[PDB]
Amino acid sequence: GTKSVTRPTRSSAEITCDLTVINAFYIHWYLHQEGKAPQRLLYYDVSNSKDVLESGLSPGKYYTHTPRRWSWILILRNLIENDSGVYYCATWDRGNPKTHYYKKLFGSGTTLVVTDKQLDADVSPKPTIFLPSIAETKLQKAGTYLCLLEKFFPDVIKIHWQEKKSNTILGSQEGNTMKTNDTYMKFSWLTVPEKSLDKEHRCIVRHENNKNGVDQEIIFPP
Amino acid sequence: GTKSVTRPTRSSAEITCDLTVINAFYIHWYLHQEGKAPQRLLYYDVSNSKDVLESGLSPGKYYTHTPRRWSWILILRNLIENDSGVYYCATWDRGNPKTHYYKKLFGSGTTLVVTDKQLDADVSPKPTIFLPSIAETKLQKAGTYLCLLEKFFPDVIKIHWQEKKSNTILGSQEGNTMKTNDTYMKFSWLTVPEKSLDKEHRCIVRHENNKNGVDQEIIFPP
Amino acid sequence: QKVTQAQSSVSMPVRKAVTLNCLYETSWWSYYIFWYKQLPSKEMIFLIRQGSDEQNAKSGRYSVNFKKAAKSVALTISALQLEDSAKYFCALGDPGGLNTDKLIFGKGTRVTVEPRSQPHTKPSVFVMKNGTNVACLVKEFYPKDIRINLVSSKKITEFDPAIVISPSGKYNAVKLGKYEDSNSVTCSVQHDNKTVHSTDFE
Amino acid sequence: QKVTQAQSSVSMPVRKAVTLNCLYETSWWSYYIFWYKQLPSKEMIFLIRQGSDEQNAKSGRYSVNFKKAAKSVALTISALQLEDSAKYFCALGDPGGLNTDKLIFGKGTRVTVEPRSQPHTKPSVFVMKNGTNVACLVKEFYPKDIRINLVSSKKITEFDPAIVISPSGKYNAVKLGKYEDSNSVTCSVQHDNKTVHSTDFE
Amino acid sequence: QVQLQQPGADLVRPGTSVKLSCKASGYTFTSYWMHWVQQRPGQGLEWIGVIDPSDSYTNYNQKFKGKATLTVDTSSSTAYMQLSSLTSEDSAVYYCARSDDYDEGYFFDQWGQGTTLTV
Amino acid sequence: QVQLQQPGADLVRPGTSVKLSCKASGYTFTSYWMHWVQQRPGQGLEWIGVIDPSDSYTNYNQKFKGKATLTVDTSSSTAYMQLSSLTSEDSAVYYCARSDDYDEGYFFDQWGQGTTLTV
Amino acid sequence: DVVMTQTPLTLSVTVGQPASISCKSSQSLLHSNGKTYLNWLLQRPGQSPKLLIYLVSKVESGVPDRFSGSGSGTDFTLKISRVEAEDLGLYYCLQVTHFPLTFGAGTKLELK
Amino acid sequence: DVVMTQTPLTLSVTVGQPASISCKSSQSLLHSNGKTYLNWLLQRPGQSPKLLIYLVSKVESGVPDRFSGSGSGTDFTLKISRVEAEDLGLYYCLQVTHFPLTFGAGTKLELK
Ligand SMILES: *[C@@H]1O[C@H](CO)[C@@H](O[C@@H]2O[C@H](CO)[C@@H](O)[C@H](O)[C@H]2NC(C)=O)[C@H](O)[C@H]1NC(C)=O
Ligand SMILES: *[C@@H]1O[C@H](CO)[C@@H](O[C@@H]2O[C@H](CO)[C@@H](O)[C@H](O)[C@H]2NC(C)=O)[C@H](O)[C@H]1NC(C)=O
Ligand SMILES: *[C@@H]1O[C@H](CO)[C@@H](O)[C@H](O)[C@H]1NC(C)=O
Ligand SMILES: *[C@@H]1O[C@H](CO)[C@@H](O)[C@H](O)[C@H]1NC(C)=O
Ligand SMILES: *[C@@H]1O[C@H](CO)[C@@H](O)[C@H](O)[C@H]1NC(C)=O
Numbered sequence A, B: 001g002t003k004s005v006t007r008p009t010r011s012s013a014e015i016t017c018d019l020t021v022i023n024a025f026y027i028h029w030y031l032h033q034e035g036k037a038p039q040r041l042l043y044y045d046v047s048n049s050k051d052v053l054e055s056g057l058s059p060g061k062y063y064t065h066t067p068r069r070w071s072w073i074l075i076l077r078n079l080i081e082n083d084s085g086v087y088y089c090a091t092w093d094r095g096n097p098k099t100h101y102y103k104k105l106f107g108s109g110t111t112l113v114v115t116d117k118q119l120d121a122d123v124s125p126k127p128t129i130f131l132p133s134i135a136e137t138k139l140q141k142a143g144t145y146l147c148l149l150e151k152f153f154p155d156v157i158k159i160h161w162q163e164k165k166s167n168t169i170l171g172s173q174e175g176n177t178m179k180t181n182d183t184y185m186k187f188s189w190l191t192v193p194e195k196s197l198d199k200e201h202r203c204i205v206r207h208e209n210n211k212n213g214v215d216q217e218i219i220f221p222p
Numbered sequence C, D: 001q002k003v004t005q006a007q008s009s010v011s012m013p014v015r016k017a018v019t020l021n022c023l024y025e026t027s028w029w030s031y032y033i034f035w036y037k038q039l040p041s042k043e044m045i046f047l048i049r050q051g052s053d054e055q056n057a058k059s060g061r062y063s064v065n066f067k068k069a070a071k072s073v074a075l076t077i078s079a080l081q082l083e084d085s086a087k088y089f090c091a092l093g094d095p096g097g098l099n100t101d102k103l104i105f106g107k108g109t110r111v112t113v114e115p116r117s118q119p120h121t122k123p124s125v126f127v128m129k130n131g132t133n134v135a136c137l138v139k140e141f142y143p144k145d146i147r148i149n150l151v152s153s154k155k156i157t158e159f160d161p162a163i164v165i166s167p168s169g170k171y172n173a174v175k176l177g178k179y180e181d182s183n184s185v186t187c188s189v190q191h192d193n194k195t196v197h198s199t200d201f202e
Numbered sequence E, F: 001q002v003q004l005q006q007p008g009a010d011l012v013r014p015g016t017s018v019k020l021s022c023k024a025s026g027y028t029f030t031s032y033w034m035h036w037v038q039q040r041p042g043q044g045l046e047w048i049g050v051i052d053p054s055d056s057y058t059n060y061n062q063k064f065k066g067k068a069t070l071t072v073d074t075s076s077s078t079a080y081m082q083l084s085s086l087t088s089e090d091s092a093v094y095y096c097a098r099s100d101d102y103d104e105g106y107f108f109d110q111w112g113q114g115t116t117l118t119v
Numbered sequence G, H: 001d002v003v004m005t006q007t008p009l010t011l012s013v014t015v016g017q018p019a020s021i022s023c024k025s026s027q028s029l030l031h032s033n034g035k036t037y038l039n040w041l042l043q044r045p046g047q048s049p050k051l052l053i054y055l056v057s058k059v060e061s062g063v064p065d066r067f068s069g070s071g072s073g074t075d076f077t078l079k080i081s082r083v084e085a086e087d088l089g090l091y092y093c094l095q096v097t098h099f100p101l102t103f104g105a106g107t108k109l110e111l112k
């Protein structure tokens, strides 16, 4: 359920709470920047429907929308560069057969990026796939596909290979994101045995700024 | 663009701003109850992104979400019976070839109803249409259809007749809403000349709690 | 500032003129007065704005009778149409140089436009039925005074008749009822001292 | 309260055990200490909670070395898998009887699991190309020390090689470059003092 | 002086739709209705219809309904009748007259010269 | 005392896949690898493969790759080899041996009795 | 509907003799507005008809004082105190309270 | 790949005479870990082989002190200070630093 949200300066941002808990009483929100410890920003009381901010924060900046029953959304105003990070929706758990109070259930986390977002062009990932080398299958008796993606601004990208149908999840090693100018680039590969080249493989890449608002799908030759 | 929003007590409600104005500077919100004068509740400054409440209102009750550029939404917490009414999104206009400052542009208005909404059953309108009387067309040479709707809780209902295609809008007299127990009932009629009975007519009823979340459509015999 | 509108319901014939009052008390030196119309579909539409320091402005069919020392402005609507049946709100506005300034509205009056004074017409009576529901239809009678009576034996529920204006300029009435004997009902209209039955046309 | 984690990056072989420190200063009488794991997909997963008044609790492969007067708790992970490469956060928690109580986290350490100490393996080198882009693939070499060199004439842009662990337990490397002469490139691997060329297998 | 005048006469073949006019001048053309009335040779008057020019609101006799259509040109201050399905019996003297507001006294103030429509 | 024993002998027809076992006892079966090595009659030893029971991580000789599959039953503390496509040349004495962690000294601590697989 | 009926439907009356013409209606002409409508119209042969009496009692301007109107309910009557040579022609009692706007049968005035 | 080579590949040595068996490798056996691996294994005919020398220099417990190991780089040598009747059999120098795990050709010990 991971996701990213990119917004310009002075705009407003929405961050969804992935918790499906029921009859909760408080909903805490945590910010995790880069290189810094996670820290709580606020906590929303649903018994009285009021959000309490940690000391040192300017009122009128956050909000905990509750569009439905047991569904929460954090709303940020006056976005500036510092607002970027990861946002977690968390809550304690009440009761147990053995009263441990063991954990604090944490959400899936949503990345937020704040940019200028006025000179930004279309930054959807553009795939430039690779074909297996015949010399490689000549002796090693295997094929190594390579799904290359380039020129995407939000680095939060999920690439996984599903062969032809979703039930066939194949382990695929993947390199780290590489920064090219203002955008980012990535590449993944998959090694398949002799009894795999008879099918078609897809590197189903999920990205926020992807075209059509849905995850892409790149068919490979057999 | 008129609409109605029904919500239970202690829930939260969203009211959309129908204004399509551009480069606005302030957005005022007006409440109009029944039997009482319209009164302004708050005004949102978009230059600094801050909503100012009229004196005498508890902070933490309203909010002016701005999900996109030039799109505003009012959010209400802790809904109680008194919160019902009509909400208008309004704004002054700046500049003119002759500096009149003539008007204050007003929105389409959205009705808000606050109920218990726990014992509420399915309250979508249920049509029980009527057929023209043969005796009526025997001498008067005309037909009078009658589209009856009954058992709907939100009284904000829009019934208009479109014949077969939307371009054919027919004037149709309509009776006032009648309260039956906890629900409401309505009926409309249309008189058509001799050169109209060869087609089919629809009483396209728009209602918030209508099934499938879209306006109904009732075909009539020729 | 405080704005009160005296009238609660006004009814006028078509092609005539009507006048709606608006009393108000203020404190500023220069102000403004606006008039707004609310349709049955809840749509506030601007009508006229009268400059306090200006003369009696006229805009289309709407005029304002304003005097600086009067502290009371009335709106005159000339040549009333049939779509002017609405709710009229009188709003007082602070100097519009700023953008925070709000309009303070009154309780608002209601305007209805009845058909012009017309000669009497005998209405035509018909009956429609689909299921236990029964509809009595009365067409083209000018005098509003009417008494639709449904004669049957097992009236379960009854609804007050709905009387509306027609595009022809006369009145159409429809009365809805719930009856077990759908085909055993009769309609009687006591209009203009004369009796009309539903079977007089069959 | 303030929690600091000394380590910034830790690397351990598979099937071994690792220990991560957590220093902290508090003021309350009774507290709690939790350990959380953040995957590369940004998912905080609960690992263990150690009762302050309780003994050294053990949960699965995770253990805590806690002493009441130590004011420092260390997490010992035994039998490291390959999916344990993550970011480990140490959190101090106020008495959980209330629901407003928050967890204060540290900067968090990072854990990486390299393949176990293995004998050397000669890697296999191949070249892929689609357009001006060129990919050099090196397979199944245990010693991380490697230097992939692409020999050509019109190198426009170059990317640092990506070296990853394989399901077989060894290393796979891929280097990507931009070359006008796509078919005129060669690959050289200087691994374990030995030289491997891409054409040695064709 | 208020004055309404009509074409003196008209001769058409049966089965042809005809158009009659009533030019009015010397008064507020809008504030008064316009009543068309027929007169068969050797018989009394018979009311045809009434047209209100301000709202263009028209009412017709039951017998003459559909046969006669009343229209108004407010720019030229004229009132026209369209006669359809002309036959032998549809020959008579047609008259246009001016009425009042029906609330402060109704009357036929003035009459034109009429037109003897013959088939 | 640490002890690994194997079936004494085995006789199968050519073309039939065979299964060999190496029962181990008297030590921590997990902490030490298991090396299978073949010995042709009248020739030196030839390494077949290695299996790590904790992670079940297996490596095979290039020549014997595919022919021999190594598996482990940790519950019963056993190590098995599957031999495929048996032919005339695939008859030899097969041995299982115990190794160490490769970081503090590698060696072949103990050996079984072996099994003389004949086709 | 509403139909008028003129009783004498002819009157050969010499000069100087007052005369009365009565007409009756099937239904009352008292409008719900608060007035009754009955127009006594005079048609001189060869020219357009001219209105003599409106609103039953009142008289159109430019008309001699001899003409008068009376009646109520469903029966009305026009009276001519003095009959002259210019009163000859036709007379109609016209009812406008009901929309069909029925005209009277017609009373012809003659001389002996 | 890596292949070992045993030089004498036979040794008919009488009792009491020290002997040396040398074996060489195509590539250096110095592991990047920081150790070199070369196991001197003794196979007594009729039974399973037993490990004599591990890590080139060290000696497995339960083995007489006569056996010793030396060498470095790509060349190593096992030494027997005193040759007895229980040393007869076969000897292998085994290299484990490279995964193919190549075995030696085999040195047969005999007597005159
Ligand atoms: C090299 O990359 C190009 C660009 O993606 C590949 O062309 C695609 O081929 C697939 C084959 O199924 C088509 O569906 C796509 O529409 C093509 N994309 C284009 C033309 O932009 C090409 O196949 C790659 N070469 C390989 C894999 O050998
Ligand atoms: C009386 O009302 C019923 C109930 O709506 C009408 O039945 C509908 O008939 C239309 C004909 O096109 C069907 O499409 C609908 O599905 C029917 N609705 C039902 C069965 O619930 C019936 O037509 C009406 N009688 C008339 C108009 O004479
Ligand atoms: C960025 O793009 C510019 C375009 O002029 C190019 O010169 C430069 O080399 C690029 N830099 C990188 C790091 O890709
Ligand atoms: C409301 O429903 C109840 C059901 O028992 C019925 O008795 C009653 O008459 C209904 N009232 C109205 C006003 O419809
Ligand atoms: C009015 O109704 C009464 C009922 O008794 C009847 O006598 C009278 O004639 C009616 N009048 C008209 C004008 O229909």
Ligand SMILES: *[C@@H]1O[C@H](CO)[C@@H](O)[C@H](O)[C@H]1NC(C)=O
Binding pocket: D193, D194, H026, H027, H028
């Ligand atoms: C190491 O590389 C050098 C390069 O000069 C070469 O001389 C030497 O033989 C190499 N050693 C091995 C073991 O490959």
